[PDB]
Scaffold this active site. Structure first.
Site, short mmCIF file in Angstrom:
data_model
loop_
_atom_site.label_atom_id
_atom_site.label_comp_id
_atom_site.label_asym_id
_atom_site.label_seq_id
_atom_site.Cartn_x
_atom_site.Cartn_y
_atom_site.Cartn_z
N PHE A 4 0.83 -1.20 0.00
CA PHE A 4 0.00 0.00 0.00
C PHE A 4 0.87 1.25 0.00
CE2 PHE A 4 -3.36 2.84 1.84
CZ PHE A 4 -4.26 2.67 0.80
N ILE A 39 27.21 -31.69 7.16
CA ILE A 39 28.27 -32.27 6.34
C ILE A 39 28.80 -31.22 5.38
CG2 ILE A 39 28.83 -34.05 4.67
CD1 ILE A 39 28.30 -34.96 7.59
N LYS A 40 30.12 -31.07 5.35
CA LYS A 40 30.81 -30.16 4.45
C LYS A 40 31.93 -30.91 3.74
CE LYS A 40 31.07 -26.04 7.15
NZ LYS A 40 31.08 -24.55 7.09
N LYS A 75 23.61 -33.98 8.94
CA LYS A 75 22.63 -33.14 8.27
C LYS A 75 22.94 -32.97 6.79
CE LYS A 75 21.46 -28.39 7.50
NZ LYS A 75 22.31 -27.19 7.27
N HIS A 112 14.52 -26.81 7.86
CA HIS A 112 15.49 -25.74 7.66
C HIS A 112 14.77 -24.49 7.18
CE1 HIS A 112 18.95 -23.46 6.12
NE2 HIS A 112 19.67 -24.20 6.94
#
Lengths: 120, 438, 133, 438, 120
Positions: B108, B155-156, B182, B275
């Site tokens: 608006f 996890i990376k 994860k 997530h």
């Protein structure tokens, strides 16, 4: 650099990565339950861990239940009387794991479980 | 007009959905007109009269601005309180609740900025929602885990791992003491790793770690997909593998898809880790958007067993919507962003998930701030351990349990934290190594 | 500047490109802010792959004329990061995390270069303008 | 006409599908007319004008011959390069790609012979295809097999064995060291052996051999059938038995059926071994047909995890389409039959399967020529061993691993092969016996 | 004519049909990884082979993963230092199988695995 062991250090959830508790440390964990108005209870089993024999669907495991030692100790005010039943349990079942669990009538649930004796 | 939509003597009904907007009017727009405009343009506002209004009683369908007041926040900001009738909303539809309240008013012209801060979800509306597939207590009972925060690891590298190398990292993290690993929110199904291959190898890691330790293990398998059919197909294979928990990016996937997945998880015994990817597009700026506590309430209604809740390393605001996510009854407390007393009438709570730069030294603060009913997620806090993933998990599990023991004994975590950790370093070479680098 | 600010990177015809309007925090140079946008929206286990193949990279930064402390950061995302036919995953990958980065005071995604290689994995409109007519 | 379809200054677009035809014009037909005719009769050619062309812009839909040149191959042969617009082809349909390019032009009167040699599949088209259900690396991870060619055996006699005697041969081959055994391409379901009986006994052999050795075993169970319904029914029972790999004759079954089977295998975790039965009907003659590299590219798009690739006992041509089957990016190399630079943009590769008269003495050449990412199939090379199938498998596994060891040490397989084999004969009586007869 | 044994010769994939490697042969296989710019890593397990306990769907097997000994040896230039960790592994777990695996950052995959020690 140490390699995390693959055997001989199977676990029992909360407090089982600490060293074995002294009797004073054990009483302090019991007093925590009493000060919190939670009801202590003993559980014992000759099988220490979970397995999946009857089903493998999500959330189903066997071996989560152990056997109740006597009854929950409602109205307990003496942490040493829990220790007294622990020694009774170990004398009757020296070959059984014994864990101390806790119930809350307010949350209406079991909310505590830690190992208190392992067979040699 | 004002007195059609600005009704300051209105007494809210126990069936009303209440909204608290932070409104920044345009220069020259008085607060009572901004307040009436927020209610009108989020309900029955029309720029010209229509004869069809004579076929009904519109006052029974309008939103009402029943209070507006300046806030100490920045230039020319007010809090406008709006009441929406229960009949406006489709039962069980977060999608329709959002559409009905935030669908139009934010554009608006007379409102230079607008942010939805809170919603009062009445029991008559919240009871039409399933809510969490299981909730905090059912999850503790299913996993046989009590008396401590749960522990997870992301996890990376996030992308670029093969499915098998992904599962290899998961097994090593889980076997060291973590309850969960994860899938990244971005990890769905991609050329570097297709979802069914990941589910297979991650299932092998779950069961190998569980058999080795004797504790129940899980890995949030991400079912987020481009269509509801693909999403359910991934949940169905996780059900077949018999694993305990799957995962969904509820904001990018959407509430219609998320509610369908939550219904599936309840029907098939799967825990649902949620997530909040893309939330900061909406909830970052103080002046415009929707605060995360609104998105957190909506997730609890649509359905989830975990939800990512950010970090503490602002705390009181975080503690506010943690309570809104976990508790049955939350008293009004605007200092923590709780603008309405919220009664969930026994809808289960959601486990908040703390994540972001957290390592072992933060374990006393996290355990003290969140208490036992949380999940503490580590990134490099596990994978960056100099001895690998399993010793890194062991360091985090040891650090956590030493904090829980000290707290149970009555010790003060906010003041004795460093000494509790240092003392635990003495009998845990794994923890000592982590504290030497961080 | 970091491994994420690559000001002479030549975009690939398969890259998804993004134009962010970045407002860095006080004391954050636009070069540092631009590298953070690329890193926070993309990237011992790192030795098991090649991170430069999966990183987003900020290949160009320019100021916004008429606004102080506003810059347009151009970032290139490799095609392999995205699930085919999933707008959900494209949004998750690009806008899922970076808008919360503390070094960025504000962030607005202005545009997206959707490469034909990615768009051909989408059905698109059920009919479209000409079929509808 | 010529200048509508022969456009030698055309610059190919990155979305074009490019074709390289080996054209033999009729006597009196100049090369520029043959080239224009190949493009015209494989796109928008008409023998008379039609008014409907005024309702569109046909130049956007025509194929263009943008280059033609004589080849040193036989009489009056040329290579014509044609560019096809991306809009011509149905997404995900090898069937439509073949129909669109090779459907009509090979019958044109002015072309005495015509052979499609190569296709440039652009990323904008190849991304609409699933490709291999798993591909080389996923297969290695699933089978936990690394660092050597895989080994298989074709069960003989091809036809005439009972289902149980079929599985008995399979068990003995697998237990000796082979990774796979193979249904013949002709073995589907026949009076001498019905498919479900074969699947049952072959599954028992797979699991008995796997339990005895401790290595994962497989048998390509042939799902090729007369209808897509029968084909899926056979794949479904292999899924129920839980075996790792099924098989399809993709050329005789067809691309529509093969693409459906590849989609099933991806959805259910099955590896897909592909046999190229009937390929020589098409790819043998230099002057007419379609080279195998075209059929190999089409299989990679439609879907397969293995593909039979012939023997080396012409090599550089074989190495060319092996690279086209396995690699992500293949540079133009016409000496190896690669007429176009081919970019697969992370579509998984296919494991080539070498088969034909191969025995133990050929193991050095095969390991050197193909490298680790192959399957080496033996016929009588295993079953013709004088001591039986298990010692025959052991001889092949020993011979292969002795080659891999020597190559890993830096030795020259093309020159030291015979001595590497002879040296291994000294400690493997199984290998010695094979080398005494072959 | 010899009958292929049915017991006592269970296998560990590539190189396990060869005789036990000497220490020089073992170093040559390690040098192959280093010259190839692949990262060596050790794995160990008291269970040598695959099984199917949790599922039997296509492509699912248990026992493919072993346990990582320490970390991958990034930046290794000395093949003997891999041998040094192998002897460390065997001294800590004489009852465990130990295999040497290899990772490539370029192919982004594990591409090597061969047995290096079996318990007696």
């Amino acid at each position: 650099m140490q390699v995390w062991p693959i055997e001989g250090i199977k676990k029992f959830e909360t407090l089982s990565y600490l060293p074995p508790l002294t009797v004073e440390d054990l009483l302090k964990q019991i007093e925590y339950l009493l000060r919190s108005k939670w009801v202590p209870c003993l559980e014992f089993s000759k099988v220490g861990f979970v397995y999946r024999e009857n089903h493998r669907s999500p959330g189903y495991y066997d071996g989560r239940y152990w056997t109740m030692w006597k009854l929950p100790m409602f109205g307990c005010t003496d942490a040493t009387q829990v220790l007294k039943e622990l020694e009774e349990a170990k004398k009757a079942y020296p070959d059984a794991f014994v864990r101390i669990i806790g119930f809350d009538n307010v949350r209406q649930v079991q909310l505590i479980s830690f190992i208190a004796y392992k067979p040699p | 007009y004002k007195l059609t939509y600005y009704t300051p003597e209105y007494e809210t009904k126990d069936t009303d959905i209440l909204a608290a907007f932070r409104v920044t009017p345009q220069p020259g727009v008085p607060p009572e007109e901004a307040g009436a405009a927020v209610a009108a343009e989020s309900s029955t506002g029309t720029w010209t009269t229509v004869w069809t209004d004579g076929l009904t009683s519109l006052d029974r369908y309008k939103g009402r601005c029943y209070h507006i007041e300046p806030v100490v926040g920045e230039d020319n900001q007010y809090i406008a309180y709006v009441a929406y009738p229960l009949d406006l909303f489709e039962e069980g539809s977060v999608t329709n609740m959002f559409t009905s309240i935030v669908g139009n008013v934010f554009g608006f012209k007379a409102l230079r900025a607008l942010r939805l801060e809170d919603l009062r979800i009445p029991p008559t509306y919240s009871k039409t929602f399933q809510g969490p597939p299981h909730g905090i207590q059912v999850e503790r009972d299913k996993l046989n885990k009590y008396g401590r925060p749960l522990l997870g690891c992301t996890i990376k590298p996030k992308l670029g791992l093969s499915a098998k190398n992904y599962g290899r990292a998961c097994y090593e993290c889980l076997r060291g003491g973590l309850d969960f690993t994860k899938d990244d929110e971005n990890v769905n199904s991609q050329p570097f790793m297709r979802w069914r291959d990941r589910f297979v190898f991650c299932a092998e890691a779950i069961y190998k770690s569980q058999a080795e330790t004797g504790e129940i293990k899980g890995h949030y398998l991400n079912a987020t997909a481009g269509t509801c059919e693909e999403m359910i197909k991934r949940a169905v294979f996780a059900r077949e593998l018999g694993v305990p928990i799957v995962m969904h990016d509820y904001l990018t996937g959407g509430f219609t898809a998320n509610t369908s997945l939550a219904h599936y998880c309840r029907d098939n015994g799967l825990l649902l880790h949620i997530h909040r990817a893309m939330h900061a597009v909406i909830d970052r700026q103080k002046n415009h958007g929707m605060h995360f506590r609104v998105l957190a309430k909506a997730l609890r209604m649509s359905g989830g067993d975990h939800i990512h809740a950010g970090t503490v390393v602002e705390r009181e605001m975080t503690l506010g919507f943690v309570d809104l996510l976990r508790d049955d009854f939350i008293e009004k407390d605007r200092a923590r962003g709780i603008f309405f007393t919220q009664d969930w009438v026994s809808m289960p709570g959601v486990i908040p998930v703390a994540s972001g730069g957290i390592h072992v030294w933060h374990m006393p603060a996290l355990t003290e701030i969140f208490g036992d009913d949380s999940v503490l997620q580590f990134g490099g806090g596990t994978l960056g351990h100099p001895w690998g993933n399993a010793p890194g998990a062991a360091a985090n599990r040891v650090a956590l349990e030493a904090c829980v023991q000290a707290r149970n004994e009555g010790r003060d975590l906010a003041r004795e934290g460093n000494e509790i950790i240092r003392s635990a370093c003495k009998w845990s070479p794994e923890l000592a190594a982590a504290c030497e680098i961080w």
